[PDB]
Design an enzyme around this catalytic site. Structure first.
Site, PDB file in Angstrom:
ATOM      1  N   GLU A 122       0.831   1.835  13.542  1.00 23.96           N
ATOM      2  CA  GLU A 122      -0.245   1.770  12.528  1.00 23.96           C
ATOM      3  C   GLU A 122      -1.334   0.851  13.069  1.00 23.96           C
ATOM      4  O   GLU A 122      -1.334  -0.350  12.809  1.00 23.96           O
ATOM      5  CB  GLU A 122       0.330   1.320  11.182  1.00 23.96           C
ATOM      6  CG  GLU A 122      -0.562   1.635  10.025  1.00 23.96           C
ATOM      7  CD  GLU A 122      -1.763   0.724   9.918  1.00 23.96           C
ATOM      8  OE1 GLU A 122      -1.644  -0.331   9.249  1.00 23.96           O
ATOM      9  OE2 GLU A 122      -2.794   1.049  10.548  1.00 23.96           O
ATOM     10  N   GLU A 181      -9.767  -3.086  14.937  1.00 27.81           N
ATOM     11  CA  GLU A 181      -8.368  -3.557  15.181  1.00 27.81           C
ATOM     12  C   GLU A 181      -8.129  -3.634  16.694  1.00 27.81           C
ATOM     13  O   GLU A 181      -8.013  -2.529  17.345  1.00 27.81           O
ATOM     14  CB  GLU A 181      -7.352  -2.571  14.563  1.00 27.81           C
ATOM     15  CG  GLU A 181      -6.262  -3.189  13.669  1.00 27.81           C
ATOM     16  CD  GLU A 181      -5.591  -4.506  14.069  1.00 27.81           C
ATOM     17  OE1 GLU A 181      -5.364  -4.757  15.284  1.00 27.81           O
ATOM     18  OE2 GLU A 181      -5.252  -5.270  13.151  1.00 27.81           O
ATOM     19  N   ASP A 222       0.883  -1.184   0.000  1.00 32.69           N
ATOM     20  CA  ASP A 222       0.000   0.000   0.000  1.00 32.69           C
ATOM     21  C   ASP A 222       0.914   1.225   0.000  1.00 32.69           C
ATOM     22  O   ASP A 222       1.447   1.601   1.098  1.00 32.69           O
ATOM     23  CB  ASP A 222      -0.929  -0.016   1.209  1.00 32.69           C
ATOM     24  CG  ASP A 222      -1.911   1.133   1.261  1.00 32.69           C
ATOM     25  OD1 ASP A 222      -1.645   2.197   0.629  1.00 32.69           O
ATOM     26  OD2 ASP A 222      -2.958   0.948   1.943  1.00 32.69           O
ATOM     27  N   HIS A 276      -5.533   0.048   0.997  1.00 33.67           N
ATOM     28  CA  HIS A 276      -5.983  -1.313   1.380  1.00 33.67           C
ATOM     29  C   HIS A 276      -7.113  -1.240   2.427  1.00 33.67           C
ATOM     30  O   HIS A 276      -7.648  -2.279   2.752  1.00 33.67           O
ATOM     31  CB  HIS A 276      -4.805  -2.152   1.856  1.00 33.67           C
ATOM     32  CG  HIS A 276      -3.822  -2.459   0.770  1.00 33.67           C
ATOM     33  ND1 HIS A 276      -2.741  -3.344   0.964  1.00 33.67           N
ATOM     34  CD2 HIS A 276      -3.731  -2.020  -0.516  1.00 33.67           C
ATOM     35  CE1 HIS A 276      -2.031  -3.405  -0.152  1.00 33.67           C
ATOM     36  NE2 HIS A 276      -2.607  -2.600  -1.080  1.00 33.67           N
TER      37      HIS A 276
HETATM   38  N1  LIG Z   1      -3.728  -1.847  10.022  1.00 42.66           N
HETATM   39  C1  LIG Z   1      -3.520  -2.580  11.183  1.00 42.66           C
HETATM   40  C2  LIG Z   1      -2.242  -3.380  11.149  1.00 42.66           C
HETATM   41  C3  LIG Z   1      -1.794  -3.568  12.550  1.00 42.66           C
HETATM   42  N2  LIG Z   1      -0.469  -4.163  12.680  1.00 42.66           N
HETATM   43  C4  LIG Z   1       0.594  -3.165  12.506  1.00 42.66           C
HETATM   44  C5  LIG Z   1       1.749  -3.716  11.732  1.00 42.66           C
HETATM   45  N3  LIG Z   1       2.862  -2.775  11.724  1.00 42.66           N
HETATM   46  C6  LIG Z   1       3.499  -2.442  10.588  1.00 42.66           C
HETATM   47  O1  LIG Z   1       3.164  -2.887   9.490  1.00 42.66           O
HETATM   48  N4  LIG Z   1       4.473  -1.518  10.723  1.00 42.66           N
HETATM   49  C7  LIG Z   1       5.263  -1.084   9.586  1.00 42.66           C
HETATM   50  C8  LIG Z   1       4.623  -0.038   8.717  1.00 42.66           C
HETATM   51  C9  LIG Z   1       5.058   0.157   7.413  1.00 42.66           C
HETATM   52  C10 LIG Z   1       4.516   1.157   6.631  1.00 42.66           C
HETATM   53  C11 LIG Z   1       3.558   1.991   7.138  1.00 42.66           C
HETATM   54  C12 LIG Z   1       3.105   1.798   8.426  1.00 42.66           C
HETATM   55  C13 LIG Z   1       3.620   0.779   9.201  1.00 42.66           C
HETATM   56  C14 LIG Z   1      -0.456  -4.760  13.961  1.00 42.66           C
HETATM   57  C15 LIG Z   1       0.860  -5.312  14.390  1.00 42.66           C
HETATM   58  O2  LIG Z   1       0.854  -5.239  15.826  1.00 42.66           O
HETATM   59  C16 LIG Z   1       1.034  -6.516  16.377  1.00 42.66           C
HETATM   60  N5  LIG Z   1       0.313  -6.528  17.639  1.00 42.66           N
HETATM   61  C17 LIG Z   1      -1.045  -6.530  17.816  1.00 42.66           C
HETATM   62  N6  LIG Z   1      -1.423  -6.340  19.058  1.00 42.66           N
HETATM   63  C18 LIG Z   1      -0.229  -6.219  19.748  1.00 42.66           C
HETATM   64  C19 LIG Z   1       0.063  -5.966  21.096  1.00 42.66           C
HETATM   65  N7  LIG Z   1      -0.865  -5.921  22.058  1.00 42.66           N
HETATM   66  N8  LIG Z   1       1.358  -5.839  21.445  1.00 42.66           N
HETATM   67  C20 LIG Z   1       2.296  -5.992  20.509  1.00 42.66           C
HETATM   68  N9  LIG Z   1       2.140  -6.246  19.209  1.00 42.66           N
HETATM   69  C21 LIG Z   1       0.849  -6.337  18.887  1.00 42.66           C
HETATM   70  C22 LIG Z   1       0.526  -7.486  15.322  1.00 42.66           C
HETATM   71  O3  LIG Z   1       1.131  -8.727  15.534  1.00 42.66           O
HETATM   72  C23 LIG Z   1       0.986  -6.792  14.031  1.00 42.66           C
HETATM   73  O4  LIG Z   1       2.311  -7.141  13.645  1.00 42.66           O
END
Ligand SMILES: NCCCN(CCNC(=O)NCc1ccccc1)C[C@H]1O[C@@H](n2cnc3c(N)ncnc32)[C@H](O)[C@@H]1O
Ligand SMILES: NCCCN(CCNC(=O)NCc1ccccc1)C[C@H]1O[C@@H](n2cnc3c(N)ncnc32)[C@H](O)[C@@H]1O
Ligand code: NA
Ligand code: NA
Lengths: 332, 332
Positions: free
Chosen positions: A112, A121, A20, A269
């Protein structure tokens, strides 16, 4: 929760999200255009995934970045930290942000955590939980979220719900009369929020906005979200339901950068989400459409969506109760 | 288990399954061609879904049919029983077949408990559990299951796994070097069983068969499934992995009816499944390819798949360990 963390543990899923271009490009611009806000600072990256935001914080000259990740993606983040020569500046902490220990408080939290319709989420409550680590002066990126609601007219989407249930009309499916289930099949289709994009010409009024200030909001605030609306109708026709999208703002000391999922903006997305009324409402330009959208957190890391609406000038009303756990992905 | 039963609770999912014409037509032929085996008999339909098999049992003149269903689909089955005027002859029992009470033993058990590669379904153990209700003389429909394994050659499928991981080669993805994860990304793709169909010209030997007799098999038999093979290679080329499909036979007193998911047969919603070796093996026509396919039940209502193979004439060997919980649905 095993399924949630398994899902995010896959490099194929990180690749899908990283492609994205709006999401990646906007986060990089937000962080780097505000580089003075990161330079020599302490950063927490909540749910870091592959670690890209921690690399962006490092690009802006952050002194120490705690990158917290509960899935097995934490092991892959650690490989990139080593290979990009940043073991001095990025510390990957495997575990839940609710359960891990940080050795110090942070200047800024980056994440994010946005789902469909912003809220879908389990991470957004985790993002607000992370504020226990934020210094009193500290900032959050993103800083605010705006959910937008607008009435739409789309008889093709409406009629599709009946067309998909046509299967159940069959009076002799291999000698079985299926017709008694046609109503139940239609009802089931109507209770799925529709994830896709659409021409802005289907929107019949200017959007109403519900704002969450992530600096101020508490974890518990997100359990029940009540969004009253009064639309000043700009178009005449049948209102089939409400359309939803969201913006988040990164409010830095140098500039505010917006990530918008509006249908006037390049597609993401997140697409957009539409919730049908059980029955459409006729509105003329100048009428008001008033009601409430209520989101109630359920135990499936998702939300029940209750929508009630009435055309004030006629008293004609409709409603629906949808489950955001079972969205229909209609985009083709 | 909440996710499993939610999935099957949807009329849209029942519609999707009922539109596999081979699946519906074959079950109807099996039951009705053997109508003398159902006429005036007591039937158990395990995991009845919308109830279609119970209607087929009724069509064949069964006296009493107990239709057991653990999902909310049980309420929809009950609506069809009433609307088809069969409340005298079909009794819908909501709950798990392991937990419910039947008031009597049955002449015949009917079910559709087959997953990908036959075994990928928590229902197959439930089908064998149901035999506690079967009279000593009693029958099961289906009666046996044959899993077929054959070596395949497909360099397009092999090379695709590398192509999909190309994303991770990027030395400057927004200033991040992703290349250290390319190996991990390829490895992840190789550990997904591939669900799609293919031309029979990719099969390099006659299939080996592993047979489960549902009349004889115990619940515990399905925890560990060990399938030795020795293939007499009919073609010369690189062996990229093993292809899997299955047949079930309904062994009635009038005739045996086969439901085949073989790639020589009309396509079903089971398609076929392919498991890559980590590295391909060169075999000439007349060589033997020997090894073992081991399926070990994991806690995700799925299986770990271990494959080891060697070309006897060269000693060249390869293996893989795949997770049938995370299949790649490649069919387009
Ligand atoms: N749209 C919702 C996408 C959400 N993801 C975020 C992923 N992060 C990501 O792409 N970052 C890089 C990025 C690149 C470009 C632009 C923006 C970001 C969630 C991520 O949090 C993780 N998780 C969930 N709950 C917990 C928790 N309690 N504690 C710790 N980790 C937890 C989960 O496993 C997963 O890896
Ligand atoms: N391919 C695997 C599809 C498997 N389904 C079978 C659905 N039945 C179906 O389409 N029958 C009609 C039909 C039409 C045409 C041809 C053949 C059949 C499983 C069904 O069993 C249910 N379940 C799972 N475990 C248990 C349990 N322990 N006890 C009771 N119910 C249980 C589950 O909720 C679901 O409804
Ligand atoms: Na229209
Ligand atoms: Na080839």
């Amino acid at each position: 929760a095993v399924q949630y963390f398994q899902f995010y543990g896959y490099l194929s899923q990180q690749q899908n999200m990283m492609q994205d271009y709006v999401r990646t490009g906007t986060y990089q611009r937000a962080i780097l255009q505000n580089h003075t806000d990161f330079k020599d600072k302490i950063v927490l990256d909540v749910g870091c995934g592959s670690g890209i935001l921690s690399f962006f914080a490092a690009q802006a000259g952050a002194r120490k970045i705690y990158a917290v990740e509960a899935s097995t993606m934490a092991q892959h983040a650690e490989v990139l930290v080593k290979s990009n020569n940043l073991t001095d500046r990025i510390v990957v902490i495997p575990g839940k942000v609710e359960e891990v220990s940080l050795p110090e408080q942070v200047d800024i939290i980056i994440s994010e955590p946005m789902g469909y319709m912003l809220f879908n989420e389990r991470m957004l409550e985790s993002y607000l939980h992370a504020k226990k680590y934020l210094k009193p002066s500290g900032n959050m990126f993103p800083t605010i979220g705006d959910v937008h609601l607008a009435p739409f007219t789309d008889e093709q989407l409406y009629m599709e719900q009946f067309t998909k249930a046509n299967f159940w009309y069959q009076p002799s499916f291999h000698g079985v009369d299926l017709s008694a289930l046609r109503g139940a099949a239609v009802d089931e289709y109507f209770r799925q929020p529709v994830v896709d994009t659409f021409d802005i010409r289907i929107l019949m009024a200017k959007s109403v906005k519900y704002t969450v200030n992530f600096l101020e909001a508490k974890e518990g605030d997100l359990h029940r979200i009540e969004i009253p609306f009064k639309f000043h109708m700009l178009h005449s026709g049948l209102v089939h339901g409400l359309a939803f999208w969201f913006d988040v703002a990164f409010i830095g000391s140098i500039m505010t950068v917006w990530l918008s999922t509006a249908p006037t903006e390049p597609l993401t997305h997140w697409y957009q989400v539409r919730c049908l009324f059980q029955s459409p409402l006729f509105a003329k330009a100048g009428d008001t459409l008033s009601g409430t959208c209520l989101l109630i957190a359920n135990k499936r890391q998702s939300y029940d969506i209750s929508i009630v609406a009435q055309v004030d000038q006629t008293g004609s009303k409709s409603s629906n109760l949808l489950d955001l756990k079972n969205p229909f992905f209609r985009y083709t």
